Amino acid sequence: TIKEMPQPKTFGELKNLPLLNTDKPVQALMKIADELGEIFKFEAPGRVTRYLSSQRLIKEACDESRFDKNLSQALKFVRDFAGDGLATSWTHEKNWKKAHNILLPSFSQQAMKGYHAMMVDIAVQLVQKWERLNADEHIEVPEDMTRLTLDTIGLCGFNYRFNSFYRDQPHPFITSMVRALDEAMNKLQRANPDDPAYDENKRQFQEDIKVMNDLVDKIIADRKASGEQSDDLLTHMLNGKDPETGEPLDDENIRYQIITFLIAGHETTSGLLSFALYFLVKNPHVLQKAAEEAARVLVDPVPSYKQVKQLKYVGMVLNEALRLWPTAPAFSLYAKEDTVLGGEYPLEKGDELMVLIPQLHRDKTIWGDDVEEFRPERFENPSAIPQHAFKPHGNGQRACIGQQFALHEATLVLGMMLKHFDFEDHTNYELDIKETLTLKPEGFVVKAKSKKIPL
Ligand code: HEM
Ligand SMILES: CCCCCCCN1CCC[C@H]1C(=O)N[C@@H](Cc1ccccc1)C(=O)O
Ligand SMILES: C=Cc1ccccc1
Numbered sequence: 252t253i254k255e256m257p258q259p260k261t262f263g264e265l266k267n268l269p270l271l272n273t274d275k276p277v278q279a280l281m282k283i284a285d286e287l288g289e290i291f292k293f294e295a296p297g298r299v300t301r302y303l304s305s306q307r308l309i310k311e312a313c314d315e316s317r318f319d320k321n322l323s324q325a326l327k328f329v330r331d332f333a334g335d336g337l338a339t340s341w342t343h344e345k346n347w348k349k350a351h352n353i354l355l356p357s358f359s360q361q362a363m364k365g366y367h368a369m370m371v372d373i374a375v376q377l378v379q380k381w382e383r384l385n386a387d388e389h390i391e392v393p394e395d396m397t398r399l400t401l402d403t404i405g406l407c408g409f410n411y412r413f414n415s416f417y418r419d420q421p422h423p424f425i426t427s428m429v430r431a432l433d434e435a436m437n438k439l440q441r442a443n444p445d446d447p448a449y450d451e452n453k454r455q456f457q458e459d460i461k462v463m464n465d466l467v468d469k470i471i472a473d474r475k476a477s478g479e480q481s482d483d484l485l486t487h488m489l490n491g492k493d494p495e496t497g498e499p500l501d502d503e504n505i506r507y508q509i510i511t512f513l514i515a516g517h518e519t520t521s522g523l524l525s526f527a528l529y530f531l532v533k534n535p536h537v538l539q540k541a542a543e544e545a546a547r548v549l550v551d552p553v554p555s556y557k558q559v560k561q562l563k564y565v566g567m568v569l570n571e572a573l574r575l576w577p578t579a580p581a582f583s584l585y586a587k588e589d590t591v592l593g594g595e596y597p598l599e600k601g602d603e604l605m606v607l608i609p610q611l612h613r614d615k616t617i618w619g620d621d622v623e624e625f626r627p628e629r630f631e632n633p634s635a636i637p638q639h640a641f642k643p644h645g646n647g648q649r650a651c652i653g654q655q656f657a658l659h660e661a662t663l664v665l666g667m668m669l670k671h672f673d674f675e676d677h678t679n680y681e682l683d684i685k686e687t688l689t690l691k692p693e694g695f696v697v698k699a700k701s702k703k704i705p706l
Contacts, residue, residue, distance in 0.1 A: 522578030
């Protein structure tokens with residue numbers, strides 16, 4: 252029953268590459284999937300991959316005995332500054348499992364309890380900023396969510412204060428990082444990346460890479476000279492020993508991990524919080540239900556770890572926002588051996604797949620006809636969701652190591668926003684999704700009305 256899979260329009264020797272010559276490539280690929288269906292071939296000079304959009308096929312792709320994590324071109328470009336950090340290493344590189352073993356305890360329950368007070372520190376700064384706005388000023392939502400999540404990973408993970416709420420402009424790090432990500436996206440469609448037309452891109456790229464590495468220097472310097480006794484992510488990087496190899500991380504890999512966690516540890520969580528607030532102001536009945544939970548649970552001026560764990564509906568709200576707009580919108584796999592996908596598509600060892608997560612999460616055979624609706628109650632019973640239908644944090648041993656960090660932070664912060672403010676979509680905002688490999692609303696603004704509840 253071997254089927255021929257469709258393929259979108261080609262451009263001679265450039266094959267499908269020019270389809271990525273857009274500022275919204277993921278959304279363009281979603282439109283192609285809409286037209287071609289659950290699987291389509293995508294070619295570029297010297298490369299082939301297959302975009303998967305159905306749970307039927309993705310549940311097979313998530314079989315770790317058959318498929319391993321692949322570095323997409325995007326991750327290969329990010330590797331130019333993230334090296335063999337956790338997110339851009341191959342599973343078979345020694346430094347992947349070594350750093351995984353060393354850093355997994357930094358995301359245990361007991362670790363999350365230790366981060367909680369510092370996430371409250373940053374969350375309170377956010378609430379205080381909004382309490383201090385004048386009448387009919389508004390909130391720049393992704394901007395402030397990025398302030399919050401960057402500051403949280405800086406403080407919680409590295410005892411470093413980016414002090415983003417003391418800046419009306421993005422931190423130097425954010426500016427360079429967003430620019431490096433821009434360059435990585437745009438480089439995806441460059442057919443001649445060594446054409447001298449991109450000499451300045453190359454120079455600017457190196458400049459943004461040095462900005463990010465300079466902050467890494469300072470984080471490392473302050474820690475090793477500090478006289479305070481810390482027990483955080485950086486402590487584990489500098490002191491942890493891998494049970495298997497017996498070795499700690501070396502200095503080069505530590506630097507890559509700091510870069511990795513500063514980027515991965517904030518950018519996707521700011522997108523999640525932005526999309527979540529978007530859906531809440533567009534769905535006031537949902538906002539009300541989550542606000543009622545927040546008021547009933549968050550009975551103290553400062554939320555506790557235990558209280559955040561009881562914000563179960565807020566948790567469902569976040570999962571439903573990750574369903575509709577997963578902020579790291581794709582991951583890539585390669586076939587470990589010859590194998591046949593879905594009884595219809597034979598693959599040879601080494602063949603690559605692209606999992607298009609926003610399209611998977613719109614599979615009507617899984618979610619029903621109301622798939623575009625925002626209904627957190629979809630997540631009331633994880634046993635009623637088929638396997639691998641919901642993959643916002645990737646798959647298997649290469650799934651997101653920061654999943655609990657992100658969800659604790661976002662649950663805490665959204666709980667506090669709903670406790671302390673009513674929100675108004677005063678511009679009737681039209682969703683506009685900016686792509687920087689990751690996804691985030693652009694230009695989303697709201698007004699908050701304080702409930703005047705003291706901190
Ligand atoms: C809602 C927020 C987040 C989302 C949606 C998300 C999503 C993902 C996805 C889909 C992957 C797999 C990438 C692949 O297969 O190529 C991943 C990997 C990873 N994420 Fe996240 N992430 C989030 C937050 C975080 C945070 C806060 C951190 C750090 C604290 C983090 C650290 C990582 C790391 C290190 C990896 C690589 C894991 C490994 O392969 O060992 N993420 N994330
Ligand atoms: C935080 C998430 C980072 C990883 C997700 C990046 C996901 N890409 C972000 C932009 C679009 C999307 C993607 O489909 N990329 C492919 C593009 C590609 C396919 C075939 C040949 C050449 C290039 C890739 O990078 O290989
Ligand atoms: C998980 C990898 C990643 C890569 C770039 C930005 C955010 C996350």
